Design a protein around this ligand. Structure first.
Ligand SMILES: [K+]
Ligand SMILES: [K+]
Ligand SMILES: [K+]
Ligand SMILES: [K+]
Ligand code: NA
Lengths: 115, 114
């Protein structure tokens, strides 16, 4: 197998917890071959989708903010807002990262390039 | 320029704090285009190299453990120790990650596969 021994151990254990292979493999690609990190990703991804967030934006938020749930949520909410205004995702990520999720600074930057 | 406006802003600001372009671009690639993130990476990388850690291993530790400075140090120390014992970096990273930096479990794993 192309997988390492630790990768296979993660898949075996998390699939035993009741997750599909596809979900586990995707989560492990994102979160790394550690069981708690995979489960935390799977649970957070599920909870956020259930709240109505776009799964693509959820995935961006989980990648961008691995350390703070509070910052992750702030990033997710503002990314959702700016995306619904019509800005491009690549620009939104960039300005939220530069400005530490400050809504006013991020918007000022996005507008300066809106067209 | 191939860089985004935010990337250019970071380079301009950080080079102004007296860092070389090459150091800033490398740090930005690792840490992302946010000035505090770049400065924190540059400073940590410097401090750990000054303590005598292999810069290649320092870079692996800064990548693996962005959230906990204590976890980052514990990983860096163990990766250095296991490398001295003669194990391969790729294996070492894998077992330290799986076993949450537990030395004995990681070691038993490494010896078992060797
Ligand atoms: K890997
Ligand atoms: K963070
Ligand atoms: K890593
Ligand atoms: K961490
Ligand atoms: Na990100």
């Amino acid at each position: 197998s192309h997988m390492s021994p630790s990768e296979r151990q993660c898949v075996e254990t998390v699939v035993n917890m009741g997750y599909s292979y596809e979900c586990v493999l995707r989560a492990m690609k994102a979160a790394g071959a550690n069981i708690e990190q995979i489960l935390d990703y799977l649970f957070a991804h599920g909870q956020l989708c259930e709240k109505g967030f776009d799964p693509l934006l959820v995935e961006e938020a989980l990648e961008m903010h691995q350390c703070s749930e509070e910052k992750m949520m702030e990033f997710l909410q503002l990314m959702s807002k700016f995306k619904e205004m019509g800005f491009e995702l690549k620009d939104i990520k960039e300005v939220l990262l530069l400005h530490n999720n400050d809504q006013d600074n991020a918007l000022e930057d996005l507008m300066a390039r809106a067209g």
